[PDB]
A = this chain, B = another copy of it.
Amino acid sequence: VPGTLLNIALLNLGSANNTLFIVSISKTLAANEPHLTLEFLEECISGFSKSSIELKHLCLEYMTPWLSNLVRFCKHNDDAKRQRVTAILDKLITMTINEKQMYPSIQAKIWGSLGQITDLLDVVLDSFIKTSATGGLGSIKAEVMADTAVALASGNVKLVSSKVIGRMCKIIDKTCLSPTPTLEQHLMWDDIAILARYMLMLSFNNSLDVAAHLPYLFHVVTFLVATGPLSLRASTHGLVINIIHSLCTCSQLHFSEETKQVLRLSLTEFSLPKFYLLFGISKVKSAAVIAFYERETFALTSLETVTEALLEIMEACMRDIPTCKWLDQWTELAQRFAFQYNPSLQPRALVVFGCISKRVSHGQIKQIIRILSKALESCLKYNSQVLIEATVIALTKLQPLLNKDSPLHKALFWVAVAVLQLDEVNLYSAGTALLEQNLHTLDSLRIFNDKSPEEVFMAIRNPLEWHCKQMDHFVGLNFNSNFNFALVGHLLKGYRHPSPAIVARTVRILHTLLTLVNKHRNCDKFEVNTQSVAYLAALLTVSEEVRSDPKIQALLLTVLATLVKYTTDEFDQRILYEYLAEASVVFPKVFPVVHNLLDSKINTLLSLCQDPNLLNPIHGIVQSVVYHEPQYQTSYLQSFGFNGLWRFAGPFIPDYAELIVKFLDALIDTYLP
């Protein structure tokens, strides 16, 4: 009755103008008689919801002072008092959602006042979040709540944002407490999506906030970056844009003109269509418009790209702020999620951990390669594959960090080889990235300068050899018999790869290896010999510089024939068949080996084709074959372990993966204590 009658009195007092007198009395009684507040605000919202818009303006004005007392009831933690404040907050929230034309008024005066009040903010946020939980993302209840959340922050920014971001981080951790295969499916997906919504709205106000938060916000970006429905992706792009802008202007920070220029250019870079594709935004003019499914089935290479860009943002800043711990905290946060078992997040985390880290240990590498192995076991039993790709990208970024005398640099070359053997498009891309970066790493370590790559990598195989024999005999490539041709066999599949970027990477790897094999001799890089020839034959369709023992003949021939078998470019075919015409006349006794491979395509080109330049070599080969029509059948490759060579280098798991599991586990058990 005290709160009820006092509401009736102040409402009817306006029903005409005395509004500042009513507010002065309201202020006075709010200060003097605080117990009234519980009853009064409950009664206010009841009268408000029934009343006219004119009365609703008046009502909020008289409500404004009372909010302060709402903390008193809350200190106790017994249910009844805390519950009726929580109900008052839910009623105020409900009121905010309902009165779309009171909307800036409610937010400025009611929510701005509530924004002052630190203690209550956990109750307020759980009320907001549970209000949003009523339907999740796409519920107007959640949508308005996010827009309102900025008002909560506006009074005591750092604590509100710390609790929102803290809930996001803790809820992302909670996903791992009970895993699901895919994040969008997860038992807590709506709770994450809601907080991501709030984080976009807050992020412009985070221009006041970022300095404590910046790592945690990128941790959230890392998991979310292209996930979920397209509006959440747009939101997450906006989240980063707004954070970079906030880093260019926080009045608490003092970044240099160089650091500020780096951030300005970063805003520009994040505004480019390249970054839209990275965030899983396609088919949109402006991310903003959509922010306020056609999943690109997420490519970890996109997250890698984002993460290095965010790393260059953070690094630039960290030079100017020597007193921060940001990259170390990000390293720990990413590390925790990378190592812990959670199928949805763990791949993303591994990628990020690798990108950001500035140091690594053999015990961390053991955990990563154990994760790779366990992921390949799960393939015996899509998510597993994405985890494999992630681990391989992680190994790529981590291997430049490893100590100069570590065995692991050499070991990771075989991890890459095993990954390529899997025959999965993104795994091969990752393995070639790993291999490309590994060969740069080992050359930067000087390791080739006194040894062939063959000797270095085969030494690491020798303990493994018992396992490697079983791998090579099921692959049908045998490095013990000829290292260079086996490695090239793996690389040749890279020419098939659907992406021109991965083909060009494969070419760089072959060029690197060619140079390295001759580097230990001190030869010129194009000197043809029993070791360089494999790379030269591999390079033959792709290098203008290149173009301008019966086992070795058979391998060379089989590589050229393999390259004819698959390549669709008639200009490639011209070059290759010209070399096969000479090679047939040069190696006639060995040439029968290739005939099975060539037979299908040569029938095809004879019966179909009408380019004389391509046909002249083909007719030359048939003539040469008949003229010298055996000492080596196609089976000859099988004897030394190469029957798979044409097998493997064709277009893009279980049997290979189990052997690789044993190999990786043996690699760890030999090399890692």
The complex places the Cα of A53 from the Cα of B148 at a distance, in Å, of: 18
Given the known interface contacts A104-B54, A108-B23, the answer about A150 and B61 at a Cβ–Cβ threshold of 8 Å is no
Q: Are B151 and A104 in contact (CB under 8 A)?
A: no
- With A61-B108, A108-B61 known as contacts, the answer to whether A20 contacts B101 (CB < 8 A) is no
Asked if A19 and B54 sit within 8 Å, CB to CB, the answer is: no
Asked whether, in the complex, the Cβ of B53 is within 8 Å of the Cβ of A101, the reply is: yes
Residues of B within 8 A of A466 (CB): none
Q: Count the copies.
A: 2
The residue on B at minimum CB distance from A105 is: B57
B201:A17 contact, CB within 8 angstroms: yes
Q: Which residue of B lies closest to A115 (CB)?
A: B20
Interchain CB contact under 8 A, B54 and A103: yes
Does A292 interact with chain B (Cβ within 8 Å)?
yes
Chain B, residue nearest A16 (CB):
B147
The answer on a CB contact under 8 Å between B105 and A61 is yes
Q: Is A494 interfacial (CB-CB < 8 Å)? A: no
- The A91-110 residues at the B interface (CB cut-off 8 A) are 100-105, 107-108
- Assess whether A154 is interfacial by the CB under 8 Å rule: yes
Q: Smallest CB–CB gap between A36 and chain B, Å? A: 22
Cβ contact within 8 Å between A104 and B147:
no
- With CB as the reference atom, state the residue of chain B lying closest to A153: B20
Is the Cβ of B58 less than 8 Å from the Cβ of A19? no
Contact A18 B148, CB 8 Å, known A54-B103, A104-B61: no
Q: Does A204 touch B at the CB level, under 8 Å?
A: yes
A55 to B102, CA, bound (A): 10
Q: Decide: A20 and B54 in contact? CB cutoff 8 A.
A: no
Q: Which residues of B contact A20 (CB under 8 A)?
A: 107-108, 112, 115, 150-151, 154
Residues of B within 8 A of A100 (CB): 54
Give how many A residues have a beta carbon under 8 Å from the other chain's beta carbons.
35
Question: In the docked arrangement, what's the CA distance between A104 and B18, Å?
Answer: 9
Contact indicator B17/A101 (Cβ below 8 Å): no
A19 touches B101 (CB 8 A): no
Q: Closest approach, in angstroms, between the C-beta of A97 and any C-beta of chain B? A: 12
Partner of A292, one of B16, B21, B55, B115: B16
Docked-complex contact B104 and A14, CB < 8 angstroms: yes
Chain B positions within 8 Å of A108 at CB level? 19-20, 23, 57, 61
- The 8 A CB mask of A149-169 against B (1 = contact, 0 = none) is 011001000000000000000
**Is A205 positioned at the interface, with any CB of B under 8 Å from its CB?**
yes
Given contacts A61-B108, A108-B23, A108-B61, contact A17 B102 (CB under 8 A): no
Interchain CB contact under 8 A, A204 and B18: yes
Give the interface centre of A53, A100, A115, A147 by most chain B CB atoms within 10 Å. Answer: A53
Could you tell me if B17 and A151 are in contact, using CB atoms closer than 8 angstroms?
Answer: yes
Among residues of B, the one whose C-beta sits closest to the C-beta of A108 is: B19
Q: What residues of B have a CB within 8 angstroms of the CB of A103 in the complex? A: 17, 54, 57
CB-defined contacts of A204 to chain B, threshold 8 Å: 18, 21
Taking CB atoms, residues of chain B closer than 8 Å to A18 are: 150, 204
Q: Once the chains bind, are B54 and A101 in contact (CB under 8 Å)?
A: yes
Most buried by B among A20, A24, A61, A148: A20
A interface residues with partner B (beta carbon < 8 Å): 14, 16-21, 23-24, 52-55, 57-58, 61, 100-105, 107-108, 112, 115, 147-148, 150-151, 154, 201, 204-205, 292
Closest 9 A/B residue pairs (Cβ): A57-B105, A20-B154, A17-B147, A58-B104, A19-B104, A53-B101, A57-B104, A19-B108, A17-B150
Interchain residue pairs with CB less than 8 A apart (30): A16-B104, A16-B147, A16-B292, A17-B103, A17-B107, A17-B150, A17-B151, A20-B108, A20-B112, A20-B115, A20-B151, A20-B154, A21-B150, A21-B154, A21-B204, A21-B205, A23-B108, A52-B101, A53-B101, A54-B101, A54-B103, A54-B104, A57-B103, A57-B104, A57-B105, A57-B108, A58-B104, A61-B104, A61-B105, A101-B101
